[PDB]
Design a protein around this ligand. Structure first.
Ligand SMILES: CNc1nc2c(CC[C@H]3O[C@@H](OC)[C@H](O)[C@@H]3OC)c3nc(N)[nH]c(=O)c3cc2[nH]1
Ligand SMILES: CNc1nc2c(CC[C@H]3O[C@@H](OC)[C@H](O)[C@@H]3OC)c3nc(N)[nH]c(=O)c3cc2[nH]1
Ligand SMILES: [Zn+2]
Ligand SMILES: [Zn+2]
Lengths: 366, 366
């Protein structure tokens, strides 16, 4: 049987890596894109999510502790059986979404409006009740921009919370034996704080390391600059997860900088809004120029949507507000993202990822 | 290859019949339930519609001449290739929906608000442009209640329009050779007018005969009373289609009275609203009593939804407004309707339909 957690690197090119994470509920091919799931990947059955190539999905913790409730999901058998996805699930720790969507912050945790608390201990407990396979430490995503003083204080708190997260996880035998725990690096855009955060997380020890605090308004140039120095600070032999990223070009550049795992609502959310990804760049299917276009969304995509329906039909559906429009757009977009990850993995494996990145950009931004 | 149109009756019990309609694009098992489709059966891929057991679907004419337009659908290859359903499609003629949703009525047709005209000739032409397999005559659905004078005048106009529909259909060689045409009986609740309408339609001659003008507020007792005398007036050797019906008990009683074909938005529309059909009667999945219910929607249903997800999960999805909730509710409800039709067909074939109707009602209304 598979181990609780094993990450193996099969091939490398520069800072880019390709390999596998083996967990009890399945193998995750890296670099990986993880579709974002209120206990559903919006508009898709789990079998459709899997058919697009996804190895792991993300459970929506902040949504789930509010509705339907973590204790309720546990009573019903856990998130996997509740939603019908039997493969790995990664759950965020909830603080980012509390500070984004809900607040009273303290060293103990965060209280927020129905009133609720989240602390490192309660966050880890909720993720256990959901049955998460990859548990995220409870952190604070520092707003951008941040002064050096405030970034330092925030990062220092996150590192204290990272230790509390580790200890809460380890003190729950069933969780420690069956799930994995990732720590989250903070420090805003400042190299010295990113180094201090990486050192603190490595001293505690985690199964994987996320780069937190990015994709919060800084823009791609600055994000890439921070990744340039931040990713090498993390343990090389563990997975690197860039939280909240992102657009196809952001993924390609992040892989060039050593990132192994990605999550974003862009393919799902923007799909329902009419944006379809293609190898020639995104298109907005609502545009009148597609009303009589019999071509599929993308000329090369292997997804079931591009095998069966035209741009003209999907244009009509989205303009009419039809649910099937959201279903088809989302399946195509998630499938496109997975095909992107497959091309990334194969090109690294073949030592031609730098050429792939150049070719991808030349066509995507032509 | 299959004929343009052949209806064959394989077994009978009282006024109930079971058999098949063979058309170029497929076989339709009768009694048949036809799911209602803006060029989509809401929230379902065509493959899912077929997997529930549907042999034919209904194209939404009134929606389609407005959006995306009949000429546009024809330029794109017709409704079948546009939406991805390769089996028979029946289209209504549009006047009912104009008078329900839009008006200036005359002997020529109806003008309505963008301004548009519908006449017998234009209705038949639109249905041709869509590529409909079963074309409905252009009629007037008399409002209920109607005085005898107004019901008579309305029915008389409909019969003149039925002849114009016949001639327009026959004058288009490709349509006459590949599609079928159904006439629509009118006459409100009045036996003498229903007889005059049936006689006029049989003199013209049609491939099938619909009972129009019902399911418009009269209630089941009155609808059944009108069916009692109206269905025997129609040619026995052609299919009988009750337009706009309906609830499961209405279908059972209409089959007992000689109806072969049904259409209604109830399984799709009420599914998205939280109503799920079960052999013990409908339930509203939004009710708090389902929040922790691990049973499937129905204990015997063979559909994929009942194989895989709990009431508790679907309750959560519908309460959260999630698209997947609409998808799962609609697939189950359409599958339930098809299982009802299969039990009807099998029980007629086995000479035990009267017992099935009694058993069905005892449990459904317990
Ligand atoms: C969009 N940008 C962005 N999202 C971010 C998220 C939410 C990811 C979560 O949001 C979605 C998925 O649920 C995922 O998990 C982050 N979560 C934590 N715990 N810490 C961070 O520093 C962080 C930074 C991000 N930047
Ligand atoms: C709900 N009750 C009801 N619907 C009815 C419809 C719409 C069916 C159409 O509506 C839906 C499908 O599009 C179907 O075709 C009718 N259509 C015509 N042409 N004539 C009638 O007398 C008639 C009576 C009905 N009663
Ligand atoms: Zn595609
Ligand atoms: Zn079912």
């Amino acid at each position: 049987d598979r181990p609780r957690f094993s990450f193996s690197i099969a091939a490398r090119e520069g800072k880019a890596r390709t390999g596998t994470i083996e967990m009890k509920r399945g193998v995750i091919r890296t670099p990986a894109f993880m579709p974002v799931g209120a206990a559903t990947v919006k508009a898709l059955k789990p079998e459709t999510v899997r058919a697009t190539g996804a190895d792991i999905i993300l459970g929506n913790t902040y949504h789930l502790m509010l509705r339907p409730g973590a204790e309720r999901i546990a009573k019903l058998g856990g998130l996997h059986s509740f939603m019908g996805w039997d493969r790995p699930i990664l759950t965020d720790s909830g603080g980012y979404q509390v500070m984004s969507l809900s607040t009273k912050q303290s060293e103990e945790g965060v209280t927020f409006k129905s009133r609720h608390m989240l602390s490192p201990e309660r966050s880890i407990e909720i993720q256990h009740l959901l049955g998460s396979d990859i548990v995220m430490a409870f952190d604070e995503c520092t707003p951008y921009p941040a002064t050096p003083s405030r970034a330092a204080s925030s990062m220092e708190r996150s590192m204290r919370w990272a230790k509390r997260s580790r200890d809460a996880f380890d003190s729950r035998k069933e969780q420690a034996e069956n799930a994995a725990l990732f720590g989250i690096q903070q420090g805003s855009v400042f190299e010295n704080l990113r180094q201090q955060s990486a050192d603190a997380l490595a001293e505690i020890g985690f199964d994987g390391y996320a780069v937190g605090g990015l994709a919060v308004g800084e823009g791609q140039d600055e994000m890439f600059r921070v990744l340039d120095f931040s990713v090498p600070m993390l343990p090389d032999d563990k997975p690197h997860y860039l939280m909240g990223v992102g657009k196809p070009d952001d993924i390609v550049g992040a892989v060039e900088r050593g990132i192994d795992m990605f999550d974003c609502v862009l393919p799902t959310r923007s799909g329902r809004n009419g944006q379809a990804f293609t190898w020639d760049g995104p298109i907005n299917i609502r545009n009148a120029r597609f009303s009589e276009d019999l071509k599929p969304l993308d000329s090369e995509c292997h997804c079931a949507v591009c095998q069966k329906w035209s741009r003209a039909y999907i244009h009509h559906l989205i303009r009419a507000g039809e649910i099937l429009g959201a279903m088809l757009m989302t399946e195509h977009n998630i499938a496109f993202y997975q095909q992107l990850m497959q091309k990334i993995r194969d090109s690294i494996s073949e030592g031609r990822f730098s050429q792939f990145a150049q070719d991808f950009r030349a066509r995507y931004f032509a």
